[PDB]
Design an enzyme around this catalytic site. Structure first.
Site, short mmCIF file in Angstrom:
data_model
loop_
_atom_site.label_atom_id
_atom_site.label_comp_id
_atom_site.label_asym_id
_atom_site.label_seq_id
_atom_site.Cartn_x
_atom_site.Cartn_y
_atom_site.Cartn_z
N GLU A 80 0.71 -0.88 -0.62
CA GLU A 80 0.27 0.10 -0.42
C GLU A 80 0.65 1.18 0.13
OE1 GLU A 80 -2.24 -1.76 3.89
OE2 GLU A 80 -3.93 -1.59 2.50
N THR B 148 -0.13 2.87 -7.92
CA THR B 148 -1.37 4.49 -8.67
C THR B 148 0.01 5.14 -8.91
OG1 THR B 148 -2.22 3.58 -6.61
CG2 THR B 148 -1.91 6.29 -7.88
N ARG C 67 -8.33 1.03 -4.41
CA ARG C 67 -7.25 -0.02 -3.93
C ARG C 67 -7.21 -1.25 -4.23
NH1 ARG C 67 -7.19 -4.03 0.40
NH2 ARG C 67 -5.58 -3.66 1.43
N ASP D 44 5.85 -3.30 -12.09
CA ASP D 44 4.89 -2.85 -10.60
C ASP D 44 4.65 -4.60 -10.34
OD1 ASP D 44 2.84 -1.68 -8.81
OD2 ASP D 44 1.35 -2.14 -10.05
N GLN E 156 3.83 -6.39 0.26
CA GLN E 156 3.48 -7.37 1.27
C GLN E 156 4.24 -8.08 1.12
OE1 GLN E 156 -0.50 -8.08 1.72
NE2 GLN E 156 -1.17 -5.91 2.57
N1 LIG Z 1 -4.27 10.71 -0.92
C1 LIG Z 1 -2.89 9.75 -1.84
N2 LIG Z 1 -3.56 8.88 -1.82
C2 LIG Z 1 -2.47 7.42 -1.33
C3 LIG Z 1 -0.79 8.53 -2.35
N3 LIG Z 1 -0.62 7.29 -3.39
C4 LIG Z 1 -0.98 6.00 -3.17
N4 LIG Z 1 -2.12 6.41 -2.41
C5 LIG Z 1 -3.57 5.39 -2.34
O1 LIG Z 1 -2.49 4.17 -1.26
C6 LIG Z 1 -3.29 2.70 -1.92
C7 LIG Z 1 -2.39 1.95 -1.89
O2 LIG Z 1 -1.40 2.48 -3.27
P1 LIG Z 1 -1.18 1.36 -4.52
O3 LIG Z 1 -0.32 1.39 -5.15
O4 LIG Z 1 -1.86 0.03 -4.06
O5 LIG Z 1 0.54 0.75 -3.32
P2 LIG Z 1 1.33 -0.51 -4.21
O6 LIG Z 1 2.58 0.17 -3.35
O7 LIG Z 1 1.24 -1.12 -5.20
O8 LIG Z 1 0.30 -1.48 -3.01
P3 LIG Z 1 0.60 -2.81 -2.76
O9 LIG Z 1 0.35 -3.64 -4.29
O10 LIG Z 1 2.56 -3.71 -2.19
S1 LIG Z 1 -0.03 -4.14 -1.79
C8 LIG Z 1 -4.32 3.72 -3.40
O11 LIG Z 1 -5.57 3.50 -3.16
C9 LIG Z 1 -3.66 4.73 -3.33
O12 LIG Z 1 -4.87 5.59 -4.36
C10 LIG Z 1 -1.39 9.45 -2.44
O13 LIG Z 1 0.52 9.97 -2.80
N5 LIG Z 1 -2.11 10.06 -1.92
MG LIG Z 2 0.98 -2.81 -6.35
#
Ligand SMILES: Nc1nc2c(ncn2[C@@H]2O[C@H](COP(=O)(O)OP(=O)(O)OP(O)(O)=S)[C@@H](O)[C@H]2O)c(=O)[nH]1
Ligand SMILES: [Mg+2]
Length: 332
Positions: free
Chosen positions: A12, A17, A147, A169, A173
């Site tokens: 997360e 994103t 998400r 990508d 986790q």
């Molecule tokens: N407000 C805000 N929300 C964010 C920001 N960056 C990511 N998010 C939100 O957090 C949530 C998780 O982001 P995500 O892209 O899935 O992280 P990830 O690293 O890919 O997560 P994972 O797949 O390793 S489990 C998403 O709903 C996204 O919109 C940000 O800079 N600002």
């Molecule tokens: Mg991811």
């Protein structure tokens, strides 16, 4: 030639994103997949309201409803909470609308760091009027806030100004990290995304480890990885907007979670347009946590490029990723 970038970071953090922003700026949006993200977005609305109502009585001290007449509404969401084949009728959205108006639900929400709540909860609960429509078509912002856990290795290819960029990508986790070694093939740079807003929250894998501490411990593993001596890291200090909101709220003190913050001071050597000093001090401290890790080792064989990022702001990611391409040019 083609530059292969690898997004690493804890769960997360915002890696997926970032790719979604690449699909906004350098490929034409999303293919109509999509229209299935509606289901994913509605799952987020269901997950957010279910997590909050179940927390109101398990948080210590607990939070009651501000209106006792809303009791049958909270009983409805608890009955549909375990259903995996949910229909998403108007009754569901009608209860979520009036439940979010209940100040007790907001009160339990403001203590979200005492349980596991997705960061897009406030956005989708505040945008419930659109999501509930039968002909609801998701905005690009609705798609950025959506998400979904990333399992496996998703690839995205785009080109900017006649140079190709292959982007990987991956899942963040703990159990997804096992496959990360397969992506260590022909890597020009690594984009490590860290959730700076989550200094007061704990990870989901154990509900014990601090999320920012997870990013710091994981970043050290990447930086001091024996296989990654040559590879440089582009560090995205992500979630600056959510970071500002909680620093300006003044409810969770960074010192409570990182005691050395009391001595850190803004280095006299420049903030944005009228940026609140509390927000400035907070983000520069979190940066110096990583820069402290990366300065200790490396011996000049590779470097670390920090950026303040907001993965849901399209204009921000355009600016951040723009001069990221300049860094790659200087690597030549
Ligand atoms: N407000 C805000 N929300 C964010 C920001 N960056 C990511 N998010 C939100 O957090 C949530 C998780 O982001 P995500 O892209 O899935 O992280 P990830 O690293 O890919 O997560 P994972 O797949 O390793 S489990 C998403 O709903 C996204 O919109 C940000 O800079 N600002
Ligand atoms: Mg991811």
């Amino acid at each position: 030639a083609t530059h292969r970038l690898l997004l690493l970071g804890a769960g997360e953090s915002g890696k997926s994103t970032i790719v979604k922003q690449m699909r906004i700026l350098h490929v034409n949006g999303f293919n109509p997949e999509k229209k299935q993200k509606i289901l994913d977005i509605r799952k987020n609305v269901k997950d957010a309201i279910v997590t909050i109502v179940s927390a109101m009585s398990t948080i210590i001290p607990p939070v009651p409803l501000a209106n006792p007449e809303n009791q049958f509404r909270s009983d409805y969401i608890k009955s549909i909470a375990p259903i995996t084949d949910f229909e998403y009728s108007q009754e569901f959205f009608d209860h979520v609308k009036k439940l979010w108006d209940d100040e007790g639900v907001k009160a339990c929400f403001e203590r979200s760091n005492e349980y596991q709540l997705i960061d897009c909860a406030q956005y989708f609960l505040e945008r419930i009027d659109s999501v509930s429509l039968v002909d609801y078509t998701p905005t690009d912002q609705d798609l950025l806030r959506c998400r979904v856990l990333t399992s496996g290795i998703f690839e995205t290819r785009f080109q900017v100004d006649k140079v190709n960029f292959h982007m990987f990508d991956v899942g963040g986790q703990r159990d997804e990290r096992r496959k990360w070694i397969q992506c260590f093939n022909d890597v020009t740079a690594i984009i490590y995304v860290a959730a700076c807003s989550s200094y007061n929250m704990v990870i989901r894998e154990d509900n014990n480890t601090n999320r920012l501490r997870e990013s710091l411990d994981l970043f050290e593993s990447i930086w001091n990885n024996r296989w990654l001596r040559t590879i440089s890291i582009i560090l995205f200090l992500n979630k600056q907007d959510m970071l500002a909101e909680k620093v300006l709220a003044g409810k969770s003190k960074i010192e409570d979670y990182f005691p050395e913050y009391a001595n850190y001071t803004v280095p006299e050597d420049t903030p944005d347009a009228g940026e609140d000093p509390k927000v400035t001090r907070a983000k520069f401290f979190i940066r110096d946590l990583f820069l402290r890790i990366s300065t200790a080792t490396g011996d000049g064989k590779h470097y670390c490029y920090p950026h303040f990022t907001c993965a849901v702001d399209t204009e921000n990611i355009r600016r951040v990723f723009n001069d990221c391409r300049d860094i790659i040019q200087r690597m030549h």
